[PDB]
Amino acid sequence: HPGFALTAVRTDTFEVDMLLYSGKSCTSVIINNPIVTKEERDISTTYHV
Amino acid sequence: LSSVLEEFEVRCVAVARRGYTYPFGDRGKARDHLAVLDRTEFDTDVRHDAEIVERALVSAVILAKMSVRET
Amino acid sequence: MDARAVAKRPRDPADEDNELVTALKAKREVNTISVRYLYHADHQALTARFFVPEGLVEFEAQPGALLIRMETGCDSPRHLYISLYLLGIRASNVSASTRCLLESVYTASAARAALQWLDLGPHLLHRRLETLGCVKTVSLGITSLLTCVMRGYLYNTLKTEVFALMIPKDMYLTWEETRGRLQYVYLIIVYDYDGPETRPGIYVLTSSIAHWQTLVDVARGKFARERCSFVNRRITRPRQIPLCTGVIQKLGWCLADDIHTSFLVHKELKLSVVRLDNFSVELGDFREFV
Amino acid sequence: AMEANIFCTFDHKLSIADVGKLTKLVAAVVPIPQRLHLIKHYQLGLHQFVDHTRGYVRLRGLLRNMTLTLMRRVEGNQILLHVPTHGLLYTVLNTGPVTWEKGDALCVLPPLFHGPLARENLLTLGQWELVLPWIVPMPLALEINQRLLIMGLFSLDRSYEEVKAAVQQLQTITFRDATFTIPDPVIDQHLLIDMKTACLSMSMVANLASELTMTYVRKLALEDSSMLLVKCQELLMRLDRERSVGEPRTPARPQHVSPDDEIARLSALFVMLRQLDDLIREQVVFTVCDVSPDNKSATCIFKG
Amino acid sequence: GLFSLDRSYEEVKAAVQQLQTITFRDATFTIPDPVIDQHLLIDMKTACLSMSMVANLASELTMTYVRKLALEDSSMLLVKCQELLMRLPARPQHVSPDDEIARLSALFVMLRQLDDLIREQVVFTVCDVSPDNKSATCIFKG
Incomplete structure (x- = not known):
């Protein structure tokens, strides 16, 4: 035994399945209509809604 | 030996001038002997000179053998 | 072989319904998505998204700044996107007061890694760089996703606003006292030679000249002093053979009349810069010369 | 309207398995000696320029005048081949040995396959095959073109071991990712006339x-x-050394x-x-922007 | 422009009489009054x-x-x-x-x-040539 005490710390990962309660009409969700922008990959043409 | 001893570093450093340039099949191995080659010095005591010579020639001949692909 | 068809004027794509609308029309279904108009459908300009570290975001939130790839030994990352401003701390052309100014803003380990990478190698900087274009629509985040123009005009989405290229006033210089109605923009590294290291000398030289012959020749006027520094080094150091004296590459072109003095605003620090406005991009490549 | 294209046909019949090998080449450059419309497949590709005594210089010296052209859509009995236009986007396959990082300045070079076999054989057809030029980043082309020019100077003196070892290193390039050795121009104890x-x-x-x-x-x-x-x-x-105390200063x-x-x-x-x-x-002929995952497909604006 | 200097002025005339001519593509051609100049001196x-x-x-x-x-x-x-x-x-x-x-x-x-x-700098790159030779299509405009 040396003269040193040792105090290791160690984090532990636990999977958790949270429940989430909230009151009715707690927040608004104003939304614009979705829109399709067009890119141009040289063969296939990707979009971005 | 002090007359030869000063000249000895000149011929020793001259080998490094060509050792960095000459091609090899494993440049990273020959570079280690080149690094030891440039660190050579001389202790104030005369007795230490005999050891540095073996530290140099052994590291140097391993480089020279590769030029002819000697085993 | 329809004679009525060859006489037709070409049909505009806009005259036809959008390609998504042409599919929905056959089923007459109405999706919730608004396919009535396709945004970004009209851009001659080319762009690409580039992930960037957050430690280089400064002096880039304003649209219009050069992106230059910089490979450096390790594969993690294989490349880095230096700002033209971040490279100016290495430039000898920058004023000592201006150099101390912005360099304090680049107080990040990622930006600090750039200055270390310029030091590690004997190899000259100009071959390590490759211009990608100019900043547009910064993502602004923990890991910014900068968009960069490969060709054409810089501008805001839907062409609501035309982005202006920003170049610092110190790097900018002129040759002829009478600008033409049009002049091409050039990025021009110019090494000046010195004992311990060959210091870079950044410049941006807009000029009405386009032909490569007359461009490099008028460049030898003001830069003749660097040529004497190079020829002197060529005989000074046998078995030491630096290449070139300066490097030119086309950066694009501008209307010249748009040019005027301006200043950036970031971190409560104004920084005067020449302001190219309608800067269409026309990237070229570095051209070695003495 | 249909996009403008170059029709091409094979005089030889195609097996159903052979038609599927072309599907891998749908997004790859196919050099054409001269702009035309209908083109026989014997004219197609770089293979028509193959020579014995002629060296690597003959390929690049003629390839510079050739009209580069993308593969478009194989029709079975016919093959479209759109010609890229300057300043416009065009995909290219990574036929070249080296992986393509974003923004690299691509340029065309004739292929330089070396000794031991790797992937290569694909389209044997009538005792003929469709070889393609390597597409390489610009800085590497600055080096690969120089490695041949030095080995040609050493072709005169294989007799000594020092040159014999030095040629082996220039033969073996070392760069990022996988290395790909450059075949020796020397052959039959005498240099080819092109080198x-x-x-x-x-x-x-x-x-x-x-x-x-x-x-x-x-x-x-x-x-x-x-x-x-x-x-x-x-x-x-x-x-190199400073003048000794003798002539000539001039x-x-x-x-x-x-x-x-x-x-x-x-x-x-x-x-x-x-x-x-x-x-x-x-000279640059392509400039990639974003690169597809697994370093296969690429998105390059055309140049030249 | 190189030959003109460090040489006798009469010796220059023997070269100017012949160097100005060119026999490219069979047909001969002649330069209109070549002259050594400061415009060439920077080229020198x-x-x-x-x-x-x-x-x-x-x-x-x-x-x-x-x-x-x-x-x-x-x-x-x-x-x-x-x-x-x-x-x-x-x-x-x-x-x-x-x-x-x-x-x-x-x-x-x-x-x-x-x-x-x-x-x-290349101004045009021919692809096809008309039999009349009066005109031809080109690529890579200046």
């Missing part, structure tokens, strides 16, 4: 230029403009010389550069 | 400075490559080279793969700026 024409194109300027510049620098030096001409005169000595210069024969040496000097001109300047 | 200095620097870039073996060839091989192309060069195996002095590739890459820098003084 010999290239080595002679440099060897003339390497020597003939030395004694011809001496006549003219001395007279321009009196004008004393930028003062560089006086310092340039010391460069002419081509010394560079060597031709004596007498026939009045008209001196004119012939000047015209002979520049003409060698024209044979070397194909090697003097690599 | 750019060549005398560039070509002189090329002399201090060839390797000691690369300059010897001619003499190495004539001792072992000869051809009709080489026979003309023997007259152009100065009047009058063995170990290479050194063979460094790094020193050689470095001097070679710097040598191309001098040439790319050297060729361009006689080169011009």
Whole structure:
């Protein structure tokens, strides 16, 4: 035994399945209509809604 | 030996001038002997000179053998 | 072989319904998505998204700044996107007061890694760089996703606003006292030679000249002093053979009349810069010369 | 309207398995010797330029004049081949050995497959095959073109081990990702005429230029403009070590010389550069932006 | 512009009478009044400075490559080279793969700026030629 005490710390990962309660009409969700922008990959043409 | 001893570093450093340039099949191995080659010095005591010579020639001949692909 | 068809004027794509609308029309279904108009459908300009570290975001939130790839030994990352401003701390052309100014803003380990990478190698900087274009629509985040123009005009989405290229006033210089109605923009590294290291000398030289012959020749006027520094080094150091004296590459072109003095605003620090406005991009490549 | 394209057909019949091998090449460059419409497959590809005694220089010297063209859509009995337009986007396959990082300046070079077999054979057809040029980043092309030019100078002296080892290193390039060794131009103990024409194109300027510049620098030096001409005169000595306490401070210069024969040496000097001109300047032909995952497909604006 | 200096003025007339003519593509042509000028003097200095620097870039073996060839091989192309060069195996002095590739890459820098003084930017690249030869289609406009 040396003269040193040792105090290791160690984090532990636990999977958790949270429940989430909230009151009715707690927040608004104003939304614009979705829109399709067009890119141009040289063969296939990707979009971005 | 002090007359030869000063000249000895000149011929020793001259080998490094060509050792960095000459091609090899494993440049990273020959570079280690080149690094030891440039660190050579001389202790104030005369007795230490005999050891540095073996530290140099052994590291140097391993480089020279590769030029002819000697085993 | 329809004679009525060859006489037709070409049909505009806009005259036809959008390609998504042409599919929905056959089923007459109405999706919730608004396919009535396709945004970004009209851009001659080319762009690409580039992930960037957050430690280089400064002096880039304003649209219009050069992106230059910089490979450096390790594969993690294989490349880095230096700002033209971040490279100016290495430039000898920058004023000592201006150099101390912005360099304090680049107080990040990622930006600090750039200055270390310029030091590690004997190899000259100009071959390590490759211009990608100019900043547009910064993502602004923990890991910014900068968009960069490969060709054409810089501008805001839907062409609501035309982005202006920003170049610092110190790097900018002129040759002829009478600008033409049009002049091409050039990025021009110019090494000046010195004992311990060959210091870079950044410049941006807009000029009405386009032909490569007359461009490099008028460049030898003001830069003749660097040529004497190079020829002197060529005989000074046998078995030491630096290449070139300066490097030119086309950066694009501008209307010249748009040019005027301006200043950036970031971190409560104004920084005067020449302001190219309608800067269409026309990237070229570095051209070695003495 | 249909996009403008180049139709092409095979005189040979195609097996159903053979048609599927072309599907991998749908997004790859296919060089064409000359712009046309209908084209026989014998004209198609770089394979028609294959030669025995001719070296690598013959391929690149003719490939520079060739019209690069993308593969478009195989029709079975016909093959479309759209020609890229300058300033516009066009996909290209990563046929080249090296992986393509974003923004790299691609350029075309003839293939340089070496000794041991790798992936290569694909389209045997009538004792004929569709080879394709390598597409390479610009900085590597600056190196690969130079490695051949040095090994051609060493073709004269295989006898000594020192050159025999030094050629092996230039034969083996070392860069990022996988290395790909460059095949030796030397063969049958004698250099090929194309590399010999290239080595002679440099060897003339390497020597003939030395004694011809001496006549003219001395007279321009009196004008004393930028003062560089006086310092340039010391460069002419081509010394490495500082001069020993002996002659000559002045560079060597031709004596007498026939009045008209001196004119012939000047015209002979520049003409060698024209044979070397194909090697003097690599040129970008593609500029990639975003790169597809697994370093296969690419998105490149066309150049040239 | 090079020949005119360091030479007798009457000797220059013998060259100007003939160098102005060109027999390219069978048909002859003639330059309209060539004159040495300050416009050429900058073209002289750019060549005398560039070509002189090329002399201090060839390797000691690369300059010897001619003499190495004539001792072992000869051809009709080489026979003309023997007259152009100065009047009058063995170990290479050194063979460094790094020193050689470095001097070679710097040598191309001098040439790319050297060729361009006689080169011009391409204005057109023909693809097809009409039988009348009056006109033809082209690519790569200036």
